[PDB]
Amino acid sequence: AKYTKEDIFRFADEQNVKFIRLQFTDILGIIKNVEIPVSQLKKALDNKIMFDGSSIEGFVRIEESDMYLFPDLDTWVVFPWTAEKGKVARMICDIYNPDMTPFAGDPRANLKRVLKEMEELGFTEFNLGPEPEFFLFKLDENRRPTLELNDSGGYFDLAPTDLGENCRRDIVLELEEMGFEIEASHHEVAPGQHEIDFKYEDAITACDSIQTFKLVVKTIARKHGLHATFMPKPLFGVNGSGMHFNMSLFNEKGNAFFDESGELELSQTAYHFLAGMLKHARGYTAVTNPTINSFKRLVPGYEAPCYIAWSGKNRSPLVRVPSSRGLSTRLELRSVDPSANPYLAMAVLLKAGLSGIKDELTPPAPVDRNIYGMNEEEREATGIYDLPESLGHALIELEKNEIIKDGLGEHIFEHFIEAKTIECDMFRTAVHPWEREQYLEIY
Amino acid sequence: AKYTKEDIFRFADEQNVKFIRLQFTDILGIIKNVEIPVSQLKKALDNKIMFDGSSIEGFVRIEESDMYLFPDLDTWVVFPWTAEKGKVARMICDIYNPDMTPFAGDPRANLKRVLKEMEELGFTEFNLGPEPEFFLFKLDENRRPTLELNDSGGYFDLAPTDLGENCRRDIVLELEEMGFEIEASHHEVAPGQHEIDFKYEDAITACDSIQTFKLVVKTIARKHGLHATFMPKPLFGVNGSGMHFNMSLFNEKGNAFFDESGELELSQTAYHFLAGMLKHARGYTAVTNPTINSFKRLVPGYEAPCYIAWSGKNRSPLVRVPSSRGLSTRLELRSVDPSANPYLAMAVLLKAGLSGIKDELTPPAPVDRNIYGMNEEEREATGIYDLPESLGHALIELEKNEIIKDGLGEHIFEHFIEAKTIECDMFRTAVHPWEREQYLEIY
Ligand SMILES: [Mg+2]
Ligand SMILES: [Mg+2]
Ligand SMILES: [Mg+2]
Ligand SMILES: [Mg+2]
């Protein structure tokens, strides 16, 4: 109980907020909210706010249903970019049915249910540290994004320098002032691409931090006359954007992935988690990469994980184990992209990993032979397998796998497949300028 | 023997040709030629012309190999649009290895081999009548195609009218003057789309007529300041272009598909051919639709065949049997598009149909229930199956089927597979403006 009702009332009185955003996330990952005056703060705290519940279902909404908007007190945050005409505050809200039951279609409720399963299994918390990457594009005269980048930087380069602008520095400063924990920020290898690293907190707080980070980055980029994009592959021939998850499992004693007497300073729980992640990776590749553009990033190379393997020496595997040990022991999954929904992503990941522990699966031997060059026979000889190359194959894998369905729940599962198949069918029937430019003259 | 060497020499002397195009077709269907003066007509007739044989292999050429260019006398044609500075003539040429053997990679030689198999099986000829459809686009200031059509016509509409222009009428008149047999021409349902129907001749002559028709249509359009396109789906939301094949099998007695005492006035040979076509349709869908844009035309509707069924009453099936009987009895395949290679198309079709006759397969019962609306269970209850929805699945079906491989030969099979896989990989890794407009601002 970080905050209480009286604390929220006192904060609203003493920083004098007049606008409150009760925000939530739908299946597609779009940040949605209802906006109320500060005079209705009491009604929000009393959990009596109605809203059109079909909104969270996305564009496939059919039947309107009124449902509650139970908020969370620990997520009270006041934005500074509010001028003098009243402050603005946001609160992450749970979705509840009118019968005082959490909605099955709410990703946050699904993540809470999966975390409850973890806790009743024997663990305490599921820490996550994400490393999102975003692109910045110069706006046009009509406040429209262009295809030109703000600077021609490089990997870890000091590209934006100083003396005003430097949107990454301003974003980091605003996030720090607002009350977020930032480890480090740098320039990614692609021009105009930046990465900001976060500390390690709980899974739900990790989702809240990710969503708030997306909102803040978009707002600050817009205010500086730029456009912030989290699409994985904005341009061809340019490196994509990733959101690598550094995740660790904790118990009553402490870190469950650390053991000084084990191989690689890893506990058997860590190996079971690795086996669970590797076995079902093809299953949840769709959840971790929900957009068509996402699979354009997953191409064979030296930085895009398109194989199913784990390593700790050669790096660039599907799952990488950082050299740090002790309380910082963790397993990194590099196939996640910023367009993914964090709630569903760690829901399916936790389920897969925990199933690997329940089944006590033995992970395959790590590969440190730089798996990009070996022949197809060599890859087939080892347990190396490729991730799905398109959204449709990933959707088929989802429809085949059953554990990921349980981790996602029912309602979320059917809604996700429905919306994704519509997006896939829309992409399939479209005619692109590539086909015209390479067949109009030839044929 | 329609023509002899002396006849060719006399023609060259009396219409005074000075430019000769020894033209041939590669695997991809692109019309290629070598151009020689009339003084070298003797060397061409002596079958002593060398050329870089790796050209017919396409862009996947690796090793240069010199090989002969044995021409065909029956295809001597003189173009009229040659002004006064000498006429131009073309001759379809077979590809021969330096050891006096036909090249395995020549589509025409493969078709000749398949026809030899047919003849030794007991049949005489394989008549074909194609119905190609093409689009006309207005050129820009820099002689570049635009996205605007020449007229907003309709199905069978009298759109181009008269008083000059009317590129379809001029094309038909030039083709008739040149010595081709034209049944009828009309305006297709899409704006700016025209269809010209041909008579029924032998398969090799059908290929020659199709290639000459493509060349003539392109040339006349260019002269009239327009661009002729055979790409199946130039625009989204606009009907595609088809090249329906009306094919019949002949024997010593006459038409092998006609029998007054049989059901539907059809012989058992016709039913065996139908069964062979239906069984392997998924196999040769790739050959009949060799481009990525081709499968954008094969979408569920009322005019695009995306199902595997035959009918003669409801129309719009995969294979339609026209009501005409007697010597005009024929089976129409509607899945072919103008971008396909006619040689490979009828090679695989003849093989499939003849295999159905050899195996005496019984075709499934025809469906006249307008197969667009019945539920998926209803379609599954009947032997209705869908054609491959993408080029990759069609390539997989080709790699699985063995009869189509025999019909294509070895060299053609591997070269086609390599080229199509390269093209599919290029399409897969590209980033299209659709993705940007759908995820850039959203994510
Ligand atoms: Mg990075
Ligand atoms: Mg990382
Ligand atoms: Mg037609
Ligand atoms: Mg037709």
Numbering used by the authors:
A (entry chain E), B (entry chain B): 2 to 444
Task: List sentences quoted exactly from the publication behind this structure.
In Gram-positive bacteria, nitrogen homeostasis is controlled by an operon encoding glutamine synthetase (GS), a dodecameric machine that assimilates ammonium into glutamine, and the GlnR repressor. GlnR detects nitrogen excess indirectly by binding glutamine-feedback-inhibited-GS (FBI-GS), which activates its transcription-repression function. GS generates glutamine from glutamate, ATP, and ammonium by a mechanism that involves the initial phosphorylation of the γ-carboxyl group of glutamate by ATP and the subsequent incorporation of ammonium. The structures show FBI-GS binds the GlnR C-terminal domain within its active-site cavity, juxtaposing two GlnR monomers to form a DNA-binding-competent GlnR dimer.
These structures revealed that, like the Bs apo GS, the Lm, Sa, and most of the Pp apo GS states are dodecamers. In this conformation, key active site residues are not properly positioned for catalysis. In particular, the Arg62 side chain is rotated into the active site preventing the proper positioning of the catalytic Asp50´ side chain and Arg316, which assists in catalysis, is moved out of the active site. In fact, the electron density for the active site regions of the apo GS structures are poorly defined indicating flexibility in these regions. This suggests that they could undergo conformational changes during catalysis. The structural comparisons show that GlnR binding favors an inhibited conformation, which is also adopted by the apo state. As noted, although the apo GS structures are not optimally configured for catalysis, their active site regions are not confined and appear flexible. Hence, these regions could readily transit to the active conformation during substrate binding and catalysis.
